[PDB]
Amino acid sequence: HMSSPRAEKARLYSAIEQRLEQSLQTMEGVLSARVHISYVHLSALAVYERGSPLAHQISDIKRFLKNSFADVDYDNISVVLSE
Numbered sequence: 001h002m003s004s005p006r007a008e009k010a011r012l013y014s015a016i017e018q019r020l021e022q023s024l025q026t027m028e029g030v031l032s033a034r035v036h037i038s039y040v041h042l043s044a045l046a047v048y049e050r051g052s053p054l055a056h057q058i059s060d061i062k063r064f065l066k067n068s069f070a071d072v073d074y075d076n077i078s079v080v081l082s083e
Helices: 005-024 054-068
Strands: 030-039 041-048 077-082
Touching: 005 030, 005 041, 005 054, 041 054, 054 077
Parallel strands: 041 077
Antiparallel strands: 030 041
16 A cells, blocks of 8 residues: 555655746746646646746746656646736
């Protein structure tokens, strides 16, 4: 159970998420961020201050997340931005 490949895969994906959230929160305008890795898709929900067009910001986060977690396919990354 707790030390099995399934449970260790979750812990490791959780550790990556927490680094990706810690880093998304370093971006100008991004106040808070939440990253979920579905196993392979990635989901990001960040509260952004619209200092740039939405399309541009989504593109910036998507490129950053790919460069920081190269295991996910670009098209399988999802960014939803809040106020």
